[PDB]
């Protein structure tokens, strides 16, 4: 079929919300009517192209589904399906392919409503971004403000436990049940002794989470951070970033699976911030994926002043 953006016009475009916190499940929606201004055929299509600051999938990962996100059928004003839809993750583009519906009609009107999320990689810091959206080769301009809850959290003491994490990818479609999670260890970059980090696949009750953390279910990569001021607030973290120095190999014997659904990591005496990239799995119970990361340590000088800090995450499976 042929690209018919030049025959499709979108109108009364709306963004539901233009300020939100993607670290507390903030998101938005775009809505629009569209009308087909000329004869189009079944299999012809128009597109919507998202800007740097947005994604159509958010924290749902489609890398195990050909990197393509299924989208609910587009309806005509009369309630029937006018087009099949998919969202391409790489090009951040929705493709709406007209069905046989259009073969017998003129004056075709429809409408769509689509959730929108931050792009944690391209909008890694809190602030205001352009969010200009291209529908059927027309711009609909917007500004978006992300107030990311800060990943920099912990006990308010110069020697206190401090750590946070965020689940930034859950594969809900393929059946493989994978997830991606970024953990910042010591984001305050304090001087800490006998530091231990625990990555749990549950929070308080093990049977209330689909999380599955074990030596066969979980892979960890650990990075020493060079310049902490370049770390994201979105929790996005590129393992090939030169501001990170991988030290996974040096941890081959500092990682233990001593308890059910928990990875224990022996950081020891540290003076740096670390990034722990987690690749996990969750089970088939239908339960929410709840996680909890815990850091405990002492004062590196006196070995006293013990502190512990914990951080919860939760995404639906």
């Amino acid at each position: 079929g042929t690209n018919v953006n030049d025959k499709v016009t979108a109108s009364n475009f709306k963004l539901e919300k233009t300020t939100f916190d993607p670290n507390q499940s903030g998101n938005t929606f775009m809505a629009a009517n569209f009308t087909v201004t000329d004869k189009v055929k079944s299999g012809d299509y128009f597109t919507a192209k998202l800007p740097d600051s947005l994604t159509g999938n958010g924290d749902v990962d489609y890398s195990n589904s050909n990197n393509t996100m299924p989208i609910a059928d587009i309806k005509s004003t009369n309630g029937d399906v006018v087009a099949k839809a998919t969202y391409d993750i790489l090009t951040k583009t929705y493709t709406f392919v007209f069905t046989d519906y259009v073969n017998n009609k003129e004056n075709i009107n429809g409408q769509f409503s689509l959730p929108l999320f931050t792009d944690r990689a391209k909008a890694p810091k809190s602030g205001t971004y352009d969010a200009n959206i291209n529908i059927a080769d027309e711009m609909f301009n917007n500004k978006i403000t992300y107030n990311y809850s800060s990943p920099i959290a912990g006990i308010d003491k110069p020697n206190g436990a401090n750590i946070s994490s965020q689940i930034i990818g859950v594969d809900t479609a393929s059946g493989q049940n994978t997830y991606k999670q970024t953990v910042f260890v010591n984001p305050k970059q304090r001087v800490l002794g006998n530091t231990w980090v625990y990555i749990k696949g549950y929070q308080d009750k093990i049977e209330e989470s689909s999380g599955k953390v074990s030596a066969t279910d979980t892979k960890l990569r650990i990075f020493e951070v060079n310049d902490t001021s370049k770390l994201s607030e979105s929790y996005y973290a590129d393992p090939n970033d030169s501001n990170l120095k991988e030290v996974t190999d040096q941890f081959k014997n500092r990682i233990y699976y001593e308890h059910p659904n928990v990875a224990s990591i022996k950081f020891g005496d540290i003076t740096k911030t670390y990034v722990v990239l987690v690749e996990g799995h969750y089970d088939n119970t239908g339960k929410n994926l709840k996680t909890q990361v815990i850091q405990e340590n002492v004062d590196p000088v006196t070995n006293r002043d013990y502190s512990i800090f914990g951080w919860n995450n939760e995404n639906v499976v």
């Binding site: 993607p22 670290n23 507390q24 499940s25 903030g26 998101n27 159509g56 999938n57 958010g58 924290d59 749902v60 990962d61 996100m69 299924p70 989208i71 609910a72 969202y87 959730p115 999320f117 809850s149 990943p151 959290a153 946070s164 994490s165 965020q166 689940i167 930034i168 859950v170 809900t172 479609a173 929790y235 909890q292 815990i294 512990i308 800090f309 914990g310 951080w311 919860n312 995450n313 939760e314 995404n315």
Partner: peptide, 12 residues
């Protein structure tokens, strides 16, 4: 053991 952070995405 208990401050918090949450994500959001779409299932299409």
């Amino acid at each position: 053991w208990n401050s918090g952070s949450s994500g959001t995405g779409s299932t299409g």
